[PDB]
Nucleic acid binder design. Structure first.
Length: 114
RNA sequence: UAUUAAUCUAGAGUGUGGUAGGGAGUUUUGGAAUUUCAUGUGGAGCGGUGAAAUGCGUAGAUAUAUGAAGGAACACCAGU
C-alpha cells in the first residue's frame, strides 16, 4: 500500500534472510532459505538466496511496490545473487548501501576453530 | 703503576636557547557493537556443522525500526 520503501537482506555465512519494509520501520514480509523445501546444509548457496529474493520480490509486487532503497547485510557468497534477482526483476531500485553489523574493536568475539 | 702537592678541559655532568615523542600515573568524557529489557511491525522455522544432531522457536523466535540499561574493549589514523 506504499510506493517507496526499503528491503533488507542479511546473507549470513550459514544462511540468508530477506525482508521488505516500509520507511516507517515496520516489516511488510520476509523470506529465507528455510521457507523453501530444501533444508540442512544445502541452504547456504547463492542459488537459494536468489530464489528467496525472487519470491520476496514476487510477493511485494502485488503490494504495489515502487522505488526502493537497498541495505545489504551480512557476509557471504549469496548476497550478490539477490542483487541479480532484483535487477532482473525490473523493480525500481534506486540506492544501494552497506549495513553489516560492523562493530568497533570492542567486545571479544568467539575463537579460532581448530 | 701506586701515594701525595697542585694546574687545564677534550672525559663526564649542570646552564642557555631551540625540539620531538601511543613515556608514566591520577582525574573526567564519547561513540560503535554485543547482550538484556520495553515498544511497534509478523507468522515457522532459527541456530548449527564435512554432513548432522543436543539447543532455541505461535507462550511470536530470527528479522525490521525506536528507546532504556549495564558491562567490556578502543576498527578506519596504523607505517620495511
Amino acid at each position: 500500500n506504499v510506493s517507496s520503501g526499503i528491503i533488507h537482506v542479511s546473507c549470513s555465512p550459514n544462511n540468508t534472510i530477506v525482508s521488505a519494509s516500509d520507511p516507517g520501520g515496520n516489516v511488510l514480509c520476509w523470506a529465507s532459505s528455510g521457507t523453501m523445501g530444501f533444508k540442512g546444509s544445502r541452504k547456504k548457496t547463492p542459488y537459494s538466496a536468489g530464489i528467496a529474493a525472487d519470491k520476496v520480490a514476487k510477493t511485494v509486487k502485488e503490494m504495489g511496490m515502487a522505488t526502493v532503497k537497498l541495505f545489504v547485510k551480512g557476509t557471504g557468497r549469496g548476497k550478490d545473487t539477490a542483487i541479480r534477482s532484483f535487477a532482473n526483476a525490473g523493480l525500481s531500485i534506486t540506492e544501494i548501501n552497506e549495513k553489516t553489523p560492523i562493530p568497533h574493536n570492542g567486545c571479544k568475539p568467539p575463537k579460532r576453530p581448530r
